[PDB]
Design a protein around this ligand. Structure first.
Ligand SMILES: Nc1ccn([C@H]2C[C@H](O)[C@@H](COP(=O)(O)OP(=O)(O)OP(=O)(O)O)O2)c(=O)n1
Ligand SMILES: [Ca+2]
Lengths: 933, 353, 352
DNA sequence: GTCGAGTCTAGAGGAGCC
DNA sequence: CGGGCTCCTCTAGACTCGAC
């Protein structure tokens, strides 16, 4: 009988899986623990509820190497990270001769022997390197020059685009334009993800054994700072606890060098020739730039020497380092549809911006007529603008007769043409127009000049005045201290945010526009997304009427993401692989396009750029999901697998919820579901819509995505006012009283439903050296109780669970790599958006990849239970709800990414069909439960 | 109503109130267009040509006759599609049988109303490969709608609707929301190849075009646009009485005038500036030749009704320093600018619009 | 003969090789014009417009329909004079009733041959009766100068005074085709007979202002056949080279690609192509053709067309920016920087 | 010697992700 | 006491440098 039940009747793991994972020998909970759990659940009304058992799962799991699961994971991580710790130790004991007096002006790699002799080499040929790459931003993303070091060797690299001057270089990058750097190798840098993207062999579809260590990641692991901590640190360099300042620094190479090595200050090039200089500037100052790059490399080497022992001490579990190594090899395949997406998104953005600018420019041009007669003093919107005027400053006929008249006219016109001597040499900018209209127009010298007030947008403070926006029939007025608002006439010397008296507008009252975050925030733009419901209701109205206001807000919502992300997305470093670099499987596949382009984008991820050791990527960890109304939201859908390949991945179901629940249960009694919160977490299926997210989304009419925010806020210290404001923002049909009532209902029972979890989190946070419950990773120095005492308490309490989730990600990556190497699954790591792991797998191994992902989730949950001493796993949280098998990155495998820039969808505009989501039973039926071929 | 009065007053429309009616304007039985209307239609046709033929390497002009002879007497043309299909095989050689390629033409077609209504039509016939026929149909729908909205003060009034024929062929129909309702200004039909096969019976070897490495019989995408109804749509869209036509569509770009005394001396400068602007491709209204001088307010109102972008006022002070008063219809604001840089400013304003 | 074969092959004239003949072309019964022929006719129309309507305040465009309704049932227009005469009253308000003024239009006119269609450029000049012959001679000289301006052999354009049955002064402009001399333009001093016929009674409407007095005008009809003028210029322009005047040539510059790499050179050629198009220079997109022929064959093909210059982009253009340039008039090849090509072409067109 | 058009920087408010 | 990030536009303020 595979069906098992704990003393609390919760369906535990299948018998075979329990024997293969935990084995016989687990200590019994005891009478007292079971009595406490039963009493708690009975008091909270959960003991008598029966639940239909989930079908049992019988799997022949891969053998576990150690005596228990912890030893298994330790052995796997040690096998993974052994070749790279050796290279790190090689770097830590390096004797490096001084940098050469003169750097070599030669394209490619050059090795500097003793005393500075320059010898040309093809590749550095080292097991370990400290690498820094300089890129001339004027000429694009192609690398300009680089310097690398190793034990007893200085290396320098120069590109053709630096040593040679030519009329045109290709704007479409190729691996032949990158730096050749590639059994295992370790590359160390301060933003090594940036330097990784400029390596030739890092864009091949097949993976490479080279891994990358980052000093920023290790700094955040050892002595990192929070964003609030970073702000305070920078302010203090220019809360009663300040001991953390002397043991922490910001993620700048100079500051890290000051913190760890503490030598002379690091010097930078004053002119910043790479960021804001031409290639000629770099050619003229080649030696100085090479010297500065070498200085940066030396500083990084010293920092790594000072950091590696500290990181290995504060993060002793090998799984942490193995996951950090695996998290820095992200890979996003793309094709010519990437260029199509860029072009179409830019075109749609330009069209919508042009419609908005047409409306605004018409309103501005028609407004200039109020200058006559000083009628602007009677306009309730534009009276406060500057209407100043600038004076202009100063310092039949015969053929012969017609020719003579034409020559006379031309000469007379040329005579007056020469009076330019008296004209001032600086052309005055629109003297005859009012100042406010003057500021909205480009100057004639501007190369991107467009007639009319082209410099006009909804974000400008004059746009609401031009559109004559009204809130409940009151004109919008801007206060420098209290943001936007409206004026209620009737003053002699309505209920809203408050009648602020700092404005002193005669015969009016200033009321701030209601803000989604409370009365302590200011409204900087009335065209925010949160005002679309108010525009539709009729409280917010535009002067021209009709759809002018609603269309403005709609276009703002459509182009808001692209406005903030077009520079990031368009400037993505895409390296297009030629036909030779592609695998034979891609070429021979029926979907192969001979005239198409195949390439990849390497995300520039900092593996540990958070106090919780989360990853950071400005674009791909910010990439919006596809929406019917968002322009360019199909960004992730453009990450499309090559022919013969699919993107197999999955997302963890209620990750931090279950981590908190298991911590609270293990602290209460050594069983799953001891506490009410743990029982609720297990008793629920996402397919049936009974999980906590869906239960909240049903109890209050908000969406499940908003229920995520609500629940995770409540867990991590959000008060009742925050919950009320969130409910009112996400559910427009609620009132203030109803929001307060539903806030109490979700906060009534949290001796409570989640008391034990809170106690465990506070106990771990307040210990002398807070550590992760699973892998034992220590918190940053700048957050220990000695350093900060009772400061940043919410940060550390959330850090417990968030770093536990990062450990979950580390375990998932290690287990997936182990399963792919053991059973020879022809796939590789694609991207990890925190708790979402995506793998680029061939079509022949997609179901095996799904089974490996399910086994990985099972083993990770079992490890979480084991390190807390529970010795069992519930069946509910044993496997993923569904594993996605899709040819493009999207939140769901069925949604056709129809956007304003992609109205026809992925299936029509491109050739991408719908994917499939499979649970454990379907995977077992499709692969017989075996990961073997 | 007032728009028609202004259009006939400013010679956009050339007719009396008997013929200047909505039904006659839409049908095409109205008399000919006034000189400003002719200039506006020329500008609209030039913009259409710039957008469709000039900047596309696959679009070439085609000459279709106004009558179709043979089977008994001949008839006037009702559409430009027939001539384009007749010239398809001949124009295949230009692109070296490479698809897609198009044949574009602007001309007058005759429609029974048995009164005959003459409509000037801009037609593009796109010979697209069969597999990308829907993709090219969507692309041309978006491109033509963006073109109609490019010169529109109210782009939302130009809409699109999906429609199907009796045979079931897919297609789109563009409209302009006139004050009385939506009127069909442009039609796109995803015709197959049966029309070409009917016009070219026999071996289909001639009709084969190159879609990559395969020879296919193209699907005919017909894009027909009514330039007269489009001009009326833009006149309504543009409509202080001022016809805010697009700077690239306005019939007359600039206006010249004489400010004060002496009368004779300013005429030479006005003539020189007139000749320079005409040599630089800027259409000028010679208001300095009007014996019946009027106040500047009346002149400004007249130029606003005529959609005059700028009013250059050469004065006696120009003889001293070379500064000429410049006013614009959009802002009604006066500016001072030197003679040497007026042409460059006008060219920049027209091109960057 | 050979010229017509070249025009049919190089897409000046449409139809099969046996579907075109001299009489069909002259009578307007040809199937049509090829894209190069359409562009040449459009260039001729633009030049005529620049010479007549542009640089003259008194000349205004007119829009006459292709058919005349009402009792003479309806029938196609045969001349553009009637539309201008019908527009005489409406167009009188533009000039504030100040004679003289003219109405010009380039439209297709239908002539019974079969039905023939001719593209005719008509000028109807409303003249005070005093200077009728002076303006007639002025227009004769101006039109003859315009015809001879683009002609490599201006002597082939002639003139001949003629008298009609009514005895009114008239002048005829011809072109000397190889078979013989053919009429391409005619001017007649028609007088107020037609204006009074179309406007009987109440001559107050027909009165204008000539020296602050009201005088009925005398009309001058300047009618020229642009299709036959296009044929005349094609014959004049014709080594198989069609040396059309740069203001009339349909395509100015031919753009091609040398050896590899294909993508980079195609991008450079596309940029140059877009630049030249934005600067009003028509370019033949010869770089899109994957199949390539001999350089001499390509030069001969471009010379059969009215291609002013041929530009070839190679690897050296990537290295330094020099582009091979060949001139149609003189078979000379020179290297020019790719950033100076636009200015050179514009200067050549303006000088021509 | 004064002064006004570029020019860099910092801060605020909005907006994407998990 | 939600937490952890990311980047953008807009605007005010202080600084610079050439022209009168
Ligand atoms: N507004 C948010 C969103 C996310 N997270 C954290 C908590 C989650 O555990 C983790 C992953 O986010 P998910 O969106 O995956 O949340 P869930 O895993 O709970 O939802 P699902 O079951 O849909 O995966 O990120 C958070 O704290 N606050
Ligand atoms: Ca999740």
């Amino acid at each position: 009988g595979q069906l098992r039940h704990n003393p609390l009747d919760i369906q535990m793991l299948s018998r075979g899986l329990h024997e293969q994972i935990f084995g016989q020998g687990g200590e019994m909970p005891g009478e007292a623990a079971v009595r406490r759990s039963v009493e708690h659940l009975q008091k909270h009304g959960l003991w008598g509820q029966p639940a239909v058992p989930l079908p049992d799962v019988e799997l022949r799991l891969p053998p576990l190497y150690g005596d228990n699961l912890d030893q298994h994971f330790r052995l796997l991580a040690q096998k993974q990270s052994l070749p790279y710790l050796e290279a790190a130790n090689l770097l830590l004991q390096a004797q490096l001769p001084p940098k050469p007096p003169a750097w070599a002006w030669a394209e490619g790699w050059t090795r500097y022997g003793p005393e500075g002799e320059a010898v040309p080499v093809a590749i550095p040929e080292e097991r370990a390197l400290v690498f820094d790459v300089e890129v001339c931003l004027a000429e694009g993303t192609c690398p300009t020059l680089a310097v690398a070091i190793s034990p007893s060797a200085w290396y320098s690299w120069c590109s053709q685009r630096l040593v040679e001057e030519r009329y045109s270089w290709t704007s479409q990058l190729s691996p032949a334009d990158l730096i050749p750097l590639e059994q295992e190798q370790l590359v160390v840098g301060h933003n090594v993800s940036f330097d990784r993207a400029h390596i030739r062999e890092q864009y091949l579809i097949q993976g490479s054994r080279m891994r990358f260590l980052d000093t920023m990641s290790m700094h955040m692991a050892i002595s990192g700072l929070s964003s609030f901590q970073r702000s305070l640190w920078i302010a203090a360099k220019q809360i009663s606890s300040w001991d953390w300042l002397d043991i922490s620094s910001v993620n700048s190479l100079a500051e890290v060098h000051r913190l760890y090595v503490g030598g002379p200050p690091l010097e930078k090039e004053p002119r910043e020739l790479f960021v804001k200089g031409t290639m000629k500037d770099i050619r003229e100052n080649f030696q100085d730039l090479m010297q500065y790059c070498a200085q940066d490399v030396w500083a990084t080497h010293e920092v790594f020497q000072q950091q590696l022992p500290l990181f290995l001490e504060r993060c002793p579990h090998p799984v942490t380092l193995a996951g950090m190594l695996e998290m820095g090899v992200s890979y996003l395949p793309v094709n010519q549809n990437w260029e199509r997406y860029l072009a179409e998104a830019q075109g749609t953005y330009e069209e919508l911006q042009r419609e908005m600018k047409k409306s605004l420019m018409d309103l501005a041009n028609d407004a200039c007529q109020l200058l006559s007669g000083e009628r602007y003093k009677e306009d309730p919107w534009l009276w406060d603008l500057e209407w100043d005027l600038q004076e202009f400053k100063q310092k039949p006929c015969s053929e012969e007769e017609e020719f003579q008249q034409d020559v006379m006219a031309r000469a007379c016109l040329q005579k007056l043409k020469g009076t330019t001597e008296l004209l001032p040499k600086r052309p005055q900018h629109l003297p005859g127009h009012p100042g406010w209209y003057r500021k909205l127009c480009p100057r004639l010298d501007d190369p991107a000049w467009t007639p009319g007030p082209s410099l006009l947008s909804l974000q400008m403070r004059v746009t609401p005045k031009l559109m004559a926006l009204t809130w409940d029939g009151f004109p919008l007025h801007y206060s420098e201290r209290h943001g936007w608002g409206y004026l209620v006439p009737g003053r002699r010397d309505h209920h809203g945010n408050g009648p602020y008296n700092d404005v002193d507008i005669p015969g009016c009252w200033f009321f701030k526009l209601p803000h989604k975050d409370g009365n302590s925030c200011n409204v900087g733009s009335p065209f925010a997304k949160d005002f679309l419901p108010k525009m539709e209701d009729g409280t917010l109205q535009a002067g021209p009427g009709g759809a002018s206001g609603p269309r403005a807000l709609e276009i703002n919502k459509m182009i808001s993401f692209w406005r903030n992300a077009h520079k990031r997305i368009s400037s993505q470093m895409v390296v297009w692989l030629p036909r030779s670099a592609l695998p034979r499987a891609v070429i021979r596949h029926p979907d192969y396009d001979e005239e198409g382009l195949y390439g990849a984008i390497l995300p520039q991820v900092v593996t540990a750029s958070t106090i919780t050791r989360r990853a950071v990527e400005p674009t791909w960890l910010t990439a919006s999901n596809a929406r019917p109304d968002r322009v360019g939201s199909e960004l992730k859908a453009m990450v499309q697998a090559p022919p013969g390949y699919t993107l197999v991945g999955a997302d963890v179901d209620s990750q931090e919820l279950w981590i908190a629940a298991v911590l609270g249960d293990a602290h209460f009694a050594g069983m799953h579901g001891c506490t009410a919160f743990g029982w609720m977490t297990l008793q629920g299926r996402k397919s049936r819509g009974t999980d906590l997210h869906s239960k909240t989304a049903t109890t209050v009419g908000i969406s499940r995505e908003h229920a995520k925010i609500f629940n995770y806020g409540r867990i991590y210290g959000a008060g009742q006012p925050f919950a009320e404001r969130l409910l009112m923002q996400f559910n427009h049909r609620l009132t203030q009283q109803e929001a307060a009532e539903k806030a109490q209902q979700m906060y009534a029972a949290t001796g409570g439903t989640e008391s034990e979890m809170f106690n465990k989190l506070e106990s771990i946070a307040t210990s002398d050296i807070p550590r992760t419950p699973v892998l034992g990773c220590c918190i940053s120095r700048a957050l220990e109780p000695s350093a900060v005492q009772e400061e940043f308490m919410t940060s550390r309490v959330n850090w417990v669970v968030q770093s536990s989730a990062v450990d979950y990600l580390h375990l998932m990556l290690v287990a997936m790599k182990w399963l792919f190497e053991e059973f020879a699954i022809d796939g590789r790591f694609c991207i990890s958006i925190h708790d979402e792991v995506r793998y680029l797998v061939r079509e022949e191994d997609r179901y095996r990849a799904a089974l490996a992902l399910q086994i990985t989730n099972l083993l990770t949950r079992c490890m979480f239970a084991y390190k807390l001493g529970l010795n069992d796993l519930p069946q509910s949280v044993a496997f993923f709800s569904a594993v996605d098998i899709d040819r493009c990155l999207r939140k769901e495998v069925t949604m056709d990414c129809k956007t304003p820039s992609n109205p026809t969808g992925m299936e029509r505009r491109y050739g991408i069909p719908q994917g499939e989501a499979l649970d454990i039973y379907q995977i077992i039926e499709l692969t017989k439960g075996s990961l073997e071929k | 109503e007032a728009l028609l009065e202004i259009c006939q007053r400013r010679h956009f429309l050339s007719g009396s109130k008997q013929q200047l009616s909505r039904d006659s304007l839409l049908s095409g039985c109205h008399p000919g267009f006034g000189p400003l209307g002719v200039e506006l239609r020329k500008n609209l046709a030039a913009e259409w040509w710039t957008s469709v033929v000039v900047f596309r390497e696959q679009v070439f002009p085609v000459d279709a006759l106004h009558h179709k002879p043979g089977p008994t007497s001949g008839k006037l043309r009702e559409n430009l599609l027939h001539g384009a299909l007749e010239h398809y095989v001949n124009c295949l050689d230009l692109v070296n049988k490479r698809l897609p390629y198009g044949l574009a033409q602007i001309g007058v077609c005759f429609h029974p109303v048995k009164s005959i209504g003459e409509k000037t039509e801009a037609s593009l016939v796109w010979f697209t490969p069969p597999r990308t026929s829907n993709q090219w149909l969507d692309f041309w729908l978006r491109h033509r709608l963006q073109w109609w909205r490019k010169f529109a003060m109210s782009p939302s009034n130009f809409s699109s609707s999906d429609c199907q024929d009796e045979e079931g062929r897919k297609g789109n129909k563009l409209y302009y929301n006139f004050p009385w309702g939506k009127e069909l200004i442009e039609t796109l039909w995803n015709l197959g190849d049966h029309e070409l096969l009917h016009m070219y019976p026999g071996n289909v070897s001639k009709l084969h075009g190159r879609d990559g490495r395969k020879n296919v019989v193209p699907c005919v995408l017909s894009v027909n646009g009514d330039l007269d109804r489009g001009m009326l749509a833009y006149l309504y869209d543009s409509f202080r009485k001022v016809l805010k036509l697009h700077p690239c569509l306005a019939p007359i770009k600039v206006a010249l005038d004489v400010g004060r005394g002496p009368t004779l001396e300013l005429r030479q400068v006005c003539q020189g500036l007139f000749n320079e602007l005409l040599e630089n491709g800027i259409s000028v209204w010679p208001g300095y030749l009007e014996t019946m001088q009027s106040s500047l307010e009346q002149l400004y109102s007249k130029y606003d009704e005529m959609s005059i972008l700028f009013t250059v006022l050469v004065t006696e002070t120009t003889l001293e320093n070379g500064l000429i008063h410049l006013r614009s219809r959009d802002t009604t604001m006066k500016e001072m600018m030197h003679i040497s840089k007026l042409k460059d400013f006008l060219i920049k304003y027209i091109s960057s619009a």
